[PDB]
RNA sequence: GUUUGACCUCAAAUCAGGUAGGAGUACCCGCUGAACUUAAGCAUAUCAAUAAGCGGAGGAAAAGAAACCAACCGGGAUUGCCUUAGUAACGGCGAGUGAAGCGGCAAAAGCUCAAAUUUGAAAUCUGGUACCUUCGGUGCCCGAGUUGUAAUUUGGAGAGGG
RNA sequence: GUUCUUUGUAAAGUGCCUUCGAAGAGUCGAGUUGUUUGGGAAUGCAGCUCUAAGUGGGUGGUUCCAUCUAAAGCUAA
RNA sequence: GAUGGGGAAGCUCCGUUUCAAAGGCCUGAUUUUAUGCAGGCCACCAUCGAAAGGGAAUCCGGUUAAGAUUCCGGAACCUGG
C-alpha cells in the first residue's frame, strides 16, 4: 500500500519536497496558536503504526514547545505531551511523533483517544485504555518518550534504571533484618 | 488516627466483619467427585495423596485407586443446511457421480468447489439419505 | 481594517504557494486534463458509480425476500481506495488512474504519478478531489481507478486512454523542468 | 561503615515471615480448590545450566521447545491446555537434553487423563 | 399518623392532611409559648415530616414509571454507588472479546485433567 | 428600589417591535409571517405610540408579547426547520 | 453560469449525549532539588541522585514477554527474598561509595497492531427514533469513514490453492 | 443437573504437495555541553552541529564468531 | 482584574486592547426559474474599587424599662406605571 511509500519518503526529511513542505508548515503553524487541534494527521503512516485509527474517538493535536535550556533534564517531547494532556483532561494520551521543527521551537503531533466514547469502550482493542490506571499516562512518563527518558530497558546498560532509579535505590538501600539474624 | 477517633467517638457504628475462619476452611468447588472424597481435615497435598492424584509435578521443596477408577470411568463415557442439501441434490441429479464434469459445471458449481470438497459433500448427503 | 485570522492565513498561504519556488516533484499538478477530456472521463465514469448503501441494502433485501419463498458476473465498478489503487498499481491490473490535484497532504499523492509512469500504467490528473468524491458516494477520495469494464465501454475506455496519452502524458512530459512557482 | 546515610528511616524487620508462610499456604490451598483437577504447577522441562561452575548440575527449565513438543506427538498450542510449558525462544543444542525432555513429555502424556468437554 | 395508611389514601387527601397538620402545629405552637411544655408538638412535627416524605415518594414512584423502559433516566434516580463505578466499563464492555481472541479460545479451550494413569 | 428607567415597564415591555420580535424568534420574516397567518395573529396599536416604542416617535408596528411567546412553542416552528434541513 | 453546489478550513447554541479540576497520600510513577554533618580546614568528593516544593494513579503501583544474560554440555518474561558480596568496581584511589551473571526459593500467561486488495460488492461503527427476553438486543433514520472502518497474521513465521 | 435455539454450500484445528512470502527514521549512530551511575570498557539521561543501511544494525569473545533485530501497544502472582 | 494570547515541568508570572469570527439598533407586502432571507448604521468590548467623592425625596409635636428624620398624630416631598 501507500503506507510503505510514505514511510520511505518521510525518512528523507532533507529531500527537496519535504524541505518545501516543512518550510511552509513551519510558518503555517507559527501563525496559529501554540496548541491547536488538527483535522487530520500530517503523517498518516506514522500515526497508523502508532496505533491510531480513523474511527470516531481519536483526535490529532498540534503543539509547540520552546527549545534550549542553567540546565534542564526532560525531553521536549515529554513536555509537549504533558502540556497537551493538561488541556484535554478528558482525553488519554497514547503516543506522539515528530512532524516538524524550528530553530526556536519544535513541533510534535500527539494522538489522543477518548475513553468516554462508546466506540472506544466497545472496542476490545482500545477499551484497555479506559481503565483508571492509565489516567494521565504522559504525566507519569509511561509513553514511549517517557519510558525512553526514564531509561526503562533490559541489560547491563540499564541496571540502575531497569525498574526505576528511585525504586531500585530504595530497595537496595534497606537494612533487611530477619527474625533469625543471618 | 484523626479519622479513626471519630469512628469510635460517634454512634455511627463500625461496619464489623468476620471472615478469618473462612480464610482457612475453603470448600472444594471445582469437582463433585473430589468433593465426595475430599477431606478438609487433611492438607491439599495429603488430600491429593489419599485420592491418588499427584499434588505437584515439580520436585517438592523440602521434605515430604478406587477414586481414580471412578473418575476415570466417567471420562470414557451435525447435519447439512436446506440450501446446501438442495444444491447437492441438484448436483447429483444433473451430473451424478461425474466429479470430473461436475467440477466445471458453471451453472451448479457457482463457487467452483474442488473435486474433493464436492465428493465429500456428496458422500455426506448420501450417508444422510442412503 | 481587519479580517478573520483564518481567512488571512489561507490567503497568505495561497499567495505564498503562487510565489514560492517548488521542486518538479511538486507542481507536477497544475498541468491537468482539459475541460473537454475531463468531462468525457466524468461521463464514462458516471456509468460506473459504486452501489450506494441504500441501493445495496434494497437489492439484498429483495434477494432475501425471493430466497425466503424458495450467476451474474462481478459488477464492474470504479476503484478509488488509495491503498487499493496503489495495490492495483505496481501489479499492472490498473488500466486508468485519476489523481486529484487538491489533496491537503501533498506527500500522499506526490509519488503516485511517478509510480504510475514508471509502471507504464495510464494516469491522468483531474482538478478537484470533490468531483471524484461526488461520483463515488463519498466526500472525496483523492484517487480513482478503473478495472475490467463492460464490452460496450471497452472502446470508449481505449479512446479515452489514447486521448489522455496524446494530451497530458506526452505534452506535459516536459514538466520535469521549469520549477513551478516562478511567477514574479 | 555503610551507615552514613539515614538507614534508620528504612529498616523493614521481617516479622511477616511467620505470617507469610501461612498466607502462602492458604493461597496454595485456594488454588488447589479452584484448580482441583489439575496440578498447581505446570510440567517443566529438564535443562542443563551454563556457567560451568554450575553446568554439572541438572536443573529444571522454563518450557519445552517447539521441536520437543513436535517430537512428543502433540502441538505447542494444544500442549498449553494440557499444562505443558512451551518456550518459543529456547533452542535445543544438546541431544541428551532433547531426549530427556522427549521422554518426560511422553511419560506425562501417558500419565495424564483429560475429561470430556461434556 | 401511620405511613401504611397514607399510602392507600389518594394524593389530594395527603395534601389536605398536610395543611391540617400545619394548622394544628401553628395552634399548638401558639399554645406552647404560654405553657412550659407541649408533648404533642413533636408528634405533629413528625407527622408533617411523614406526610411530606409520603408525598415525595408518591411523586417519585410515578416519575420512575413515566421514564419506564426508555434510556437516559434522571440523574437523581440513577445509581448512587460511587463516582468510580460509573467508569470501570460495565460487564458487557468488560467482557467484550475481540474476534481473534474469541476464535483462539474456541479452538483451544482450557481442558481439565488429572495425572495418575 | 433604585431608579427605574422609563422605557422598561408598561407599554415598553408589553408590546415587542416587529424587528425585535423577528430577532427574538430567530425566524425569517417569511416563516414568521407564515406562522402569524396560521395562528391568526395581528398587530395592535396602543393608546400611546412613543411610550410603547421606547419613547421614540417612529411608524413602528407592535405585536402582543403573550401571543408571540405562545407562538414560540408551536411545533410548526420546528417543522419549518426540519423542512429547511431536508431541502 | 455577473450562476448553483460540491468540497477543504474555521466559528456559534443555557444545543442532545459526556468527561476534567479537588480532597486524601504510608506505598507507587515522574519533575524539581539544596544545605547542616564527614574526610589532608575543604578545591573533586560524602550527606544525595535525600528532605522541602510540584504534577499523575490503584488497592497495590511500576515493569513484563529480549536490538537480555553468557561464552558454556548454553540460560530463556517481569517481580520479590538468601547467596553472589561487602565481591567486581569506583574513590584529591584519603574518608566512603558499591553493583551485576549464575546458583537456592514464592509465581507463572502470554500476547495485540504496523507492513498484504474484502475489490465478486466499507462486508465497519457513533448517535436519534418505535419496541423488548433493558449493564444490552431488533427495524428505521442521520452521520463518521476510502487521507481506511470489517477478517487472518506477524519471527514460534505467515498467506493463496490441491 | 433440566430445557429453547442452532444450519450456514457458516466458523475452525493437524499432516502432505504446491505458489508466494511483506522488518516501526529526525530513529541507531557520531562530536560536544550539564547531570548521574562502581559502570574507566565513557552506564543512562536532556540539549546542540550532521545524519543514517537492508542477506542490513546493537552488545560482547577468537582471523572471524554467539544472541536479538529496537525505534508501536496490553497483561493477572 | 478576567477576556483572546505568551513564558513557566509545575504551584503559576506577564499582559487591559493587547493583530480575537469579543454585539447592538432599524427597515421589508413574503426574498420571483416561486414560500431555506435580504438590506441600512457605530466600532466600545466584563467586573471590583468611597458608610468623609456625586446622589430622588420627611419636618414638627409626643411617647419608652432601653428606640426616634424609624414608634404614634398632623402635614410634607422623589421615582415608575
From Swiss-Prot, chain A:
Xref: Gene3D superfamilies: Ribosomal protein l15e
Record has Cytoplasm as a keyword: yes
GO biological process annotation, one example: cytoplasmic translation
GO molecular function: RNA binding; structural constituent of ribosome
Domain of life assignment: Eukaryota
Compartment list: Cytoplasm
Compositional bias of kind Basic residues: 147-163
The UniProt record lists the keyword Transport: no
Pfam families, sorted: Ribosomal_L15e
Region annotation (Disordered) ranges: 142-163
Record's GO cellular component terms: cytosol; cytosolic large ribosomal subunit
Predominant location: cytoplasm
TM region positions: none
Purpose of the protein: Component of the ribosome, a large ribonucleoprotein complex responsible for the synthesis of proteins in the cell. The small ribosomal subunit (SSU) binds messenger RNAs (mRNAs) and translates the encoded message by selecting cognate aminoacyl-transfer RNA (tRNA) molecules. The large subunit (LSU) contains the ribosomal catalytic site termed the peptidyl transferase center (PTC), which catalyzes the formation of peptide bonds, thereby polymerizing the amino acids delivered by tRNAs into a polypeptide chain.
Subunit structure: Component of the large ribosomal subunit (LSU). Mature yeast ribosomes consist of a small (40S) and a large (60S) subunit. The 40S small subunit contains 1 molecule of ribosomal RNA (18S rRNA) and 33 different proteins (encoded by 57 genes). The large 60S subunit contains 3 rRNA molecules (25S, 5.8S and 5S rRNA) and 46 different proteins (encoded by 81 genes).
Similarity comment text for this entry: Belongs to the eukaryotic ribosomal protein eL15 family.
Name by which UniProt lists this protein: Large ribosomal subunit protein eL15A
UniProtKB/Swiss-Prot annotation, chain D:
Gene: RPL13A
GO annotations of cellular component type: cytosol; cytosolic large ribosomal subunit
One MF term in the entry's GO annotations: structural constituent of ribosome
Misc: Present with 133000 molecules/cell in log phase SD medium.
Protein's UniProt name: Large ribosomal subunit protein eL13A
Top-level taxon in the UniProt lineage: Eukaryota
Biological source species: Saccharomyces cerevisiae (strain ATCC 204508 / S288c) (Baker's yeast)
Subunit structure comment from the entry: Component of the large ribosomal subunit (LSU). Mature yeast ribosomes consist of a small (40S) and a large (60S) subunit. The 40S small subunit contains 1 molecule of ribosomal RNA (18S rRNA) and 33 different proteins (encoded by 57 genes). The large 60S subunit contains 3 rRNA molecules (25S, 5.8S and 5S rRNA) and 46 different proteins (encoded by 81 genes).
Record-stated family: Belongs to the eukaryotic ribosomal protein eL13 family.
Residues of the full protein shown: 12 to 129 of 199
Compartment(s) of residence: Cytoplasm
UniProt keyword annotations, A-Z: Cytoplasm, Phosphoprotein, Ribonucleoprotein, Ribosomal protein
GO BP of this protein: cytoplasmic translation
UniProtKB/Swiss-Prot annotation, chain E:
InterPro entries: Ribosomal_uL29, Ribosomal_uL29_CS, Ribosomal_uL29_euk, Ribosomal_uL29_sf
The keyword Protein biosynthesis appears for this protein: no
GO biological process, one term: cytoplasmic translation
GO molecular function, one term: structural constituent of ribosome
Compartment(s): Cytoplasm
Main location: cytoplasm
Disulfide bond residue pairs: none
One Gene Ontology CC term in the entry: cytosolic large ribosomal subunit
The organism's place on the tree of life at top rank: Eukaryota
Keyword Chloroplast among UniProt keywords: no
SUPFAM superfamilies for the chain: Ribosomal protein L29 (L29p)
Gene3D superfamilies assigned: 1.10.287.310, 6.10.250.3450
CDD domains associated with the record: Ribosomal_L29_HIP
Residue numbers of Phosphoserine PTMs: 10, 47
Keywords associated with the record: Cytoplasm, Phosphoprotein, Ribonucleoprotein, Ribosomal protein
The protein's assembly and partners: Component of the large ribosomal subunit (LSU). Mature yeast ribosomes consist of a small (40S) and a large (60S) subunit. The 40S small subunit contains 1 molecule of ribosomal RNA (18S rRNA) and 33 different proteins (encoded by 57 genes). The large 60S subunit contains 3 rRNA molecules (25S, 5.8S and 5S rRNA) and 46 different proteins (encoded by 81 genes). uL29 is associated with the polypeptide exit tunnel.
Note: There are 2 genes for uL29 in yeast.
Family indicated by similarity: Belongs to the universal ribosomal protein uL29 family.
Protein name per its UniProtKB record: Large ribosomal subunit protein uL29A
Encoding gene (name): RPL35A
From Swiss-Prot, chain F:
Phenotype upon loss of function: Essential gene. Reduced assembly of 60S ribosomes and accumulation of halfmer polyribosomes.
Disulfide bonds: none
Induction notes from the record: Expression is down-regulated prior to the diauxic shift.
Subcellular location: Nucleus, Nucleolus; Nucleus, Nucleoplasm
Superkingdom of source: Eukaryota
Subunit structure: Component of the NOP7 complex, composed of ERB1, NOP7 and YTM1. The complex is held together by ERB1, which interacts with NOP7 via its N-terminal domain and with YTM1 via a high-affinity interaction between the seven-bladed beta-propeller domains of the 2 proteins. The NOP7 complex associates with the 66S pre-ribosome. Also interacts with NOG1. May also associate with the origin recognition complex (ORC complex).
Miscellaneous: Present with 4530 molecules/cell in log phase SD medium.
Function description: Component of the NOP7 complex, which is required for maturation of the 25S and 5.8S ribosomal RNAs and formation of the 60S ribosome.
Family: Belongs to the pescadillo family.
The protein's name: Pescadillo homolog
Organism: Saccharomyces cerevisiae (strain ATCC 204508 / S288c) (Baker's yeast)
Full protein: residues contained: 1 to 87 of 605
